[PDB]
């Protein structure tokens, strides 16, 4: 158990073809013997080191799906990271991606709820920061609508939350460092847009920036 995990760690660090083959066979045979924690750790280690046979990953996908309900937050994060940095030829069956997608969204929603309750200004602070340098059309967006039902939704009329959006954003650095000028900000935005375009040629970030 502990020795086998250390052996996998050492072999992965060495990054030798024969060692990877030996580790792949050993883990594949001992998947049932190893517990959920060991399976998650080895899956994470393989992903970060970028090695593993397609059959091994396919069987790991089956194991993760079967044992998914008994996973903690740390276990879920490690599996997400490992399956994120997985070999390219690892087209997964349409059960694990759904589980990872659902789990990741739930973690974000729960984190948002916990942060908002602890500090009601958490959501407001983020939105102001995002909208500080945003374009005018971005600020023109409508407001949130009340989805609650009842008399106001069935027999009454509920006034909308939209109000005038002519506001001035004053940005001040908490640390006190000098802020970037308009030219510097434009260069920063342009550089990021170019990087995103290279990763995704179909991105329309150029048009979005050009709009305003």
Ligand X SMILES: CCCCCCCCCCCCCCCCCC(=O)OC[C@H](COP(=O)([O-])OCC(O)COP(=O)([O-])OC[C@@H](COC(=O)CCCCCCCCCCCCCCCCC)OC(=O)CCCCCCCCCCCCCCCCC)OC(=O)CCCCCCCCCCCCCCCCC
Positions touching ligand X (CB under 6 A) are: 152, 156-159
The H or E element spanning position 60 is: helix 54-66
Which residue of 32, 170, 201, 210 would you call a contact of another protein, by CB under 8 A?
Answer: 170
Please say whether the beta carbons of 47 and 82 come within 8 A.
yes
Contact status: 95 vs another protein (CB under 8 A): no
Please say whether the beta carbons of 191 and 185 come within 8 A.
no
Please state the closest distance from residue 143 (CB atom) to ligand X, in A: 13
* Between 154 and 173, CB nearer to ligand X: 154
Please state the closest distance from residue 149 (CB atom) to ligand X, in A: 14
Spatial distance between the Cα atoms of 102 and 68, rounded to a whole number of angstroms: 12
Q: 136-156 in b/e burial notation, b at 16+ Cβ within 10 A? A: eeeeeeeeeeeeeeeeeeeee
The H or E element spanning position 42 is: helix 36-49
Please state the closest distance from residue 75 (CB atom) to ligand X, in A: 46
- The binder of 66, among another protein, ligand X, none, by C-beta within 5 to 8 A per type, is none
Please state the closest distance from residue 122 (CB atom) to another protein, in A: 8
Which residue of 3, 17, 171, 210 would you call a contact of another protein, by CB under 8 A?
Answer: 171
* Dihedral, CA of residue 141, residue 142, residue 144 and residue 145, to nearest 10: -150
Which residue of 3, 17, 167, 210 would you call a contact of another protein, by CB under 8 A?
Answer: 167
Radius of gyration of the chain (CA): 25
- The binder of 21, among another protein, ligand X, none, by C-beta within 5 to 8 A per type, is none
Please state the closest distance from residue 148 (CB atom) to ligand X, in A: 12
Which residue of 25, 33, 72, 124 would you call a contact of another protein, by CB under 8 A?
Answer: 124
């Amino acid at each position: 158990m502990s020795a086998l995990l250390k052996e996998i760690l050492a072999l992965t660090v060495k990054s030798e073809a024969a060692l990877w083959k030996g580790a792949e066979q050993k883990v594949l045979s001992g998947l049932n013997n190893l517990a959920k924690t060991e399976l998650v750790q080895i899956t994470h280690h393989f992903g970060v080191n970028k090695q593993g046979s397609e059959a091994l990953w396919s069987q790991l996908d089956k194991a993760a799906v079967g044992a998914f309900p008994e996973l903690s937050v740390d276990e879920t994060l490690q599996l997400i990271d490992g399956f994120g940095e997985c070999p390219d030829s690892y087209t997964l069956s349409h059960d694990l991606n759904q589980r990872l997608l659902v789990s990741w969204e739930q973690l974000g929603k729960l984190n948002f709820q916990k942060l908002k309750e602890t500090n009601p200004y958490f959501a407001s602070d983020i939105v102001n920061q995002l909208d500080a340098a945003a374009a005018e059309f971005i600020k023109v967006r409508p407001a949130a609508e009340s989805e609650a039902g009842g008399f106001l939704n069935s027999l009454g009329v509920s006034s909308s939350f939209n109000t005038t959006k002519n506001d001035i954003y004053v940005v001040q650095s908490a640390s006190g460092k000098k802020l970037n000028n308009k030219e510097q900000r434009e260069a920063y935005v342009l550089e990021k847009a170019q990087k995103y375009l290279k990763e995704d040629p179909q991105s329309k970030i150029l048009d979005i920036i050009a709009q305003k």
